[PDB]
Swiss-Prot record, chain A:
Basic residues bias (residue ranges): 1-7
Domain of life: Eukaryota
Shown segment, full-protein numbering: 24 to 105 of 108
Protein known as: Small ribosomal subunit protein eS25A
GO biological process, one term: cytoplasmic translation
Primary localization class, coarse: cytoplasm
Subcellular location: Cytoplasm
Alphabetical keyword list: Cytoplasm, Methylation, Ribonucleoprotein, Ribosomal protein
Keyword DNA-binding applies: no
GO molecular function annotations of the record: structural constituent of ribosome
Organism in which the protein naturally occurs: Saccharomyces cerevisiae (strain ATCC 204508 / S288c) (Baker's yeast)
KW Ribosomal protein (keyword) present: yes
From Swiss-Prot, chain B:
Superkingdom classification of source: Eukaryota
Phenotypic consequence of R56 to E/Q: Loss of mature 18S rRNA, protein doesn't bind 20S pre-RNA complex. Lethal in double RPS19A/RPS19B mutant
Protein name: Small ribosomal subunit protein eS19A
Misc remark: Present with 29000 molecules/cell in log phase SD medium.
Curated annotation (Swiss-Prot), chain D:
Other facts: Present with 30500 molecules/cell in log phase SD medium. There are 2 genes for eS17 in yeast.
Similarity field: Belongs to the eukaryotic ribosomal protein eS17 family.
Localization per Swiss-Prot or TrEMBL: Cytoplasm
Part of the whole protein covered: 2 to 64 of 136
Complex and partners: Component of the small ribosomal subunit (SSU). Mature yeast ribosomes consist of a small (40S) and a large (60S) subunit. The 40S small subunit contains 1 molecule of ribosomal RNA (18S rRNA) and 33 different proteins (encoded by 57 genes). The large 60S subunit contains 3 rRNA molecules (25S, 5.8S and 5S rRNA) and 46 different proteins (encoded by 81 genes).
Protein name, as recorded: Small ribosomal subunit protein eS17B
Purpose of the protein: Component of the ribosome, a large ribonucleoprotein complex responsible for the synthesis of proteins in the cell. The small ribosomal subunit (SSU) binds messenger RNAs (mRNAs) and translates the encoded message by selecting cognate aminoacyl-transfer RNA (tRNA) molecules. The large subunit (LSU) contains the ribosomal catalytic site termed the peptidyl transferase center (PTC), which catalyzes the formation of peptide bonds, thereby polymerizing the amino acids delivered by tRNAs into a polypeptide chain.
Organism: Saccharomyces cerevisiae (strain ATCC 204508 / S288c)
UniProtKB/Swiss-Prot annotation, chain F:
Start-end of Basic residues biased regions: 132-141
Protein name: Small ribosomal subunit protein uS9A
Subunit organization: Component of the small ribosomal subunit (SSU). Mature yeast ribosomes consist of a small (40S) and a large (60S) subunit. The 40S small subunit contains 1 molecule of ribosomal RNA (18S rRNA) and 33 different proteins (encoded by 57 genes). The large 60S subunit contains 3 rRNA molecules (25S, 5.8S and 5S rRNA) and 46 different proteins (encoded by 81 genes).
Phylogenetic classification of the source organism: Eukaryota, Fungi, Dikarya, Ascomycota, Saccharomycotina
Cross-link (Glycyl lysine isopeptide (Lys-Gly) (interchain with G-Cter in ubiquitin)): K28, K45, K57
Amino acid sequence: KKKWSKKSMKDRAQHAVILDQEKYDRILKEVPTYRYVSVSVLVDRLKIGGSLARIALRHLEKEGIIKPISKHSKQAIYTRAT
Amino acid sequence: PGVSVRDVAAQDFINAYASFLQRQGKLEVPGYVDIVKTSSGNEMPPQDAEGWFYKRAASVARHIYMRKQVGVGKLNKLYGGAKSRGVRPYKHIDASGSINRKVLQALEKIGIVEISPKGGRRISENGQRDLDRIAAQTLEEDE
Amino acid sequence: FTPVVLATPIPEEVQQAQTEIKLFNKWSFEEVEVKDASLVDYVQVRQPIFVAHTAGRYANKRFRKAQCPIIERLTNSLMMNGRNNGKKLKAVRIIKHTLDIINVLTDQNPIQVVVDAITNTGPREDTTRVGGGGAARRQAVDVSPLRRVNQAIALLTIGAREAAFRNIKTIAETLAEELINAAKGSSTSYAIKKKDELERVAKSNR
Amino acid sequence: GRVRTKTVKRASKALIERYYPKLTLDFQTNKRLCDEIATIQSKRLRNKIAGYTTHLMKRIQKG
Amino acid sequence: SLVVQEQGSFQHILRLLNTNVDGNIKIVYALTTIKGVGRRYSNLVCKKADVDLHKRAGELTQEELERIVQIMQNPTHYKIPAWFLNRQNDITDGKDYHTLANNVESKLRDDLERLKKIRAHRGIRHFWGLRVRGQHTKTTGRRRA
Amino acid sequence: AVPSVQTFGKKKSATAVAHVKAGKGLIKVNGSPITLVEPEILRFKVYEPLLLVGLDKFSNIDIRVRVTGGGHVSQVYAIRQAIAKGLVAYHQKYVDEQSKNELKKAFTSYDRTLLIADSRRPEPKKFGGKGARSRFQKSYR
Amino acid sequence: IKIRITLTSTKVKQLENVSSNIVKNAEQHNLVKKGPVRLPTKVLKISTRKTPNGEGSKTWETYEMRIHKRYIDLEAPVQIVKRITQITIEPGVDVEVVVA
Amino acid sequence: LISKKRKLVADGVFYAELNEFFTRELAEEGYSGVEVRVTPTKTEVIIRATRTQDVL
Amino acid sequence: TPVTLAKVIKVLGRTGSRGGVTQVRVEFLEDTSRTIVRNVKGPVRENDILVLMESEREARRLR
RNA sequence: UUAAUUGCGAUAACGAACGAGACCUUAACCUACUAAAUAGUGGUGCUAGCAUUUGCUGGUUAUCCACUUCUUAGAGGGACUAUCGGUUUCAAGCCGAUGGAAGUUUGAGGCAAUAACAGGUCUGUGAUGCCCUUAGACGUUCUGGGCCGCACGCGCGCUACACUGACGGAGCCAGCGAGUCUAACCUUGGCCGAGAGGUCUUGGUAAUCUUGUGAAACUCCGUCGUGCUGGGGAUAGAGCAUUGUAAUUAUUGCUCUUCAACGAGGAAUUCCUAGUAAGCGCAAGUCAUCAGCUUGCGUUGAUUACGUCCCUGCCCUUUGUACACAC
């Protein structure tokens, strides 16, 4: 039969689902200088699963560097304190 | 001032109530929890598996209290919802009257609820006072 | 200002918004003067609203959509592509998130920078068809201010929409970055690139 | 669209023919006298007739 | 907010019942990726295993895993209600079984060719490749044969 | 006796009837205050009138409202129209015509909808289609 | 005595002159009553095709039967009761009374 | 005992069926139409027509 | 990109073979009293400002 | 000029009629009349909780008192383009603005002319002409299959192709409308069962009870993570109930398991200008059971025009014609 499609490949991203001390102090030193912060920011700049991203957002707004301003579900919005 | 469920919000209150009951531990959960999907349509069971019986209980207590008299039929029509019949279009479907009967009977055991004529169940005055006091606790907890 | 109390206590930020000045939830619709004396009279400001939703019967007459609040038009443009017909509530939610994103960024008025973006990406000359008979040809012509408005909002919405399709970067944040791109002039926003491409072919087939 | 038929126009013409003094420019009283002075089987039709009659009385008052 | 660094205890891959399984995922959906088992039974037996569902697979113990598969291959010992199972009241014993990665297709072929040899309608439909469940077959679904 | 009135606000199919009187500055809806409406933005949308006029006009006044019909948003628009209409009724009744007319003037200059209700009643269905205008589909071959 | 009279008809003006002579009879004899409890009117709708056969275009007709129902609760002794019953029998309209 | 809906429609089809009967059999007698008037313990059928003694 | 801001003062009428465009008289604001007659695509009205990427054209017609 | 052979008028025409319009229904407005536990409101008393301070939130048909704004229905009113400003032989009328519930014939329908098709239907009709058949009948009845059979092509529709999301929890609001009598409809309650479902009861011939149909979508929270992956659910297997004399090519439903194409659709093509499209689910019709069908109902609710005849076709007039079962 016929397909009428192309169906090519992509990067097949390898976002992390666990971490190490290197990734940990990386994000600790890297989350600043981010006037805008979000799950996708963490993902693309740190190559992490969204579960890691959400939990780390919770962790960092708990310890206090990132100042949230809106805690709506499906979208977490933070600045950093400075 | 006087306090009431209508005065306080819904979901945070229900969270607090189910947490209070989960801490009290005197609910006498059936035992087949962590098995069922709560319906014929919910394509999976819940996620806070150890919980959600207490949330269900708190919510139905709130609901009957706002209301007067209900039945498990009404509760199923309330708590069920959409089913994916595969390719075929969606449909509303009624939840597990057995689950609702069991939580109702748990509430009858603790005495928060009271079987009520003209059909159904109803909030008792002990439930009334502890409900208003939990509302006080929540509207103090937020600060 | 006086913080007034009632039998029912109210939050003080909203009491302040009442007593002081009409706003968004936060933002001030004033000091959003646009630079284009062409696009004035076909935008809508100085009619502030807290929410970006109301069912104003604007599309009954011709230019009452010009008198419509612009951000309402943005929401109404955002809800499309079928499955998201309606869902104006999630539209205004996304607006809320985007505007907060812009203002944590570009810390001037995000309302101001979005209006600067749409007037940045306004298409001014277009092309149009002549049939011929046997063969079709083009001819470049001018554009309405209202049409600039509609084309720009459509452009932004659709670029951010396809940016959000089948990827993790949500529509809110891709929309915000698209808007500031169009604001400054980026060579990265769908809207401006399509605009000057179209005006370029118009210039060509003048 | 907002055009009116010949039964309407001729009725208005006849009433202005033989009741010009008894009536005036006011839609309301023209309606409330039309109702009795000309048997009319339709309220909306009476209203249309009244409107046209005041149109024509204005014409007479200017020309 | 809980953040902790996964060390060599983690493993990107493992093996369960003639099948390689992926870490870096929710364990229950790893189980569903294994055959003969879906979300219901996977979630159920993970609860019976008394272990975190939130946690991934690679950072787990062989005692956990052998307890899990022990549940899977002797569930009725572990108090399963005897209606979750994908094979209730088997024809030869009347016992309610759960078929797994290989046994599913094995016993499938078994009862299918059984029908075929007793010359049943369903058997011959399965044989020729027609539709078995009383479908309409004229118009739709020509692209499987 | 009491200074009290009883008015409403209509919508597509949503009717929000409000009883208003002299009280202590309380607002309730189904026995629940205004802060528990829960579309989470339409809370501000329904605050709009009383914020426009300031809470000074709500100091010693009690409102209790009860609503039915149609969607959440329809209930909401019915509510804000009902309370605006009822406040204007109260100020027609007890307060001066001056306060009444300036009040409605502010409300209207914000929006005509706050007092007058959207009379766009829904169109019926016809045969030939799934709706009021959309026919089904043409086929020829 | 506590009767309830009711009418269950479609011919509106018939029903209404019936109700009018009813109520004026009741009030000239000076008997207690409630008003004419006017129920919501019920429209029986039948929606089908115009075409007897199957062909031609599709076209639907909607026939209607409009029903109006009224009732009042009354008290009156038996002689006035039965005179009221044996009077005010207007055709087309359907009537029935009950007690207790 | 039965609902007033089916009561009324049964009265309607009753009228229709007897009208069919009568426009069939009294057809050569100058028939035009008929009218039941409901009554307690009675129901009555005028036949508007021309050839009166003939239908009698 | 030196453009000229000029205002439609008259609409001549609709053109395109499909009513999709129009012809309008437009006065330049800079160098006032310098008129032009030109085309427009979108919805437009009287008194209406508009940017023009040139001054020196008057397309008579189109199909 | 009009939506209009609708009007102004022009005029070997005058006066009329049909169609349209008019008319009918429904949708919207009425704090004005008639009113009412088969609809509500408030208050009184009885009574629960918190506050207690006065109150707030509630339950209470025989606790009653009063009212009818919501609710119904009845009679009625109301908008006729009112006014104003331009435009127009300055006439019909057109545009804008104000006010107004409503200012595209207010909206949508119904009704819907003369002539005509060698349109469809003799399978709706005990309406049917003519022919055929009429007893091993083409009549009727009984059984079992059949109308679904699949190598393939076309038309309606439902599902999706995922974050404007899926799943699990919570909040969780409608309307149209149907219902048992000599039958067994709608069924509430409460008991059992994971569920389908079963159970013994209850109310209802109906604004009364089913039902406030506590519908869905939605919204708030979390799990997920861009992965033909928790998308999607055909395909199949096993088990469990129900409908029906009978379920076998599984009726339908519930549970577990198997989880395929599909990554937005090519030449082409459909519908559509306002609460309309579209999304959403809901009742009724068929009906013992079976909705992806239809008719209706409501819920959330956009963008894009206010034009043109370019394509496809329509109306009037003029013209040409070797056309008349008529390009």
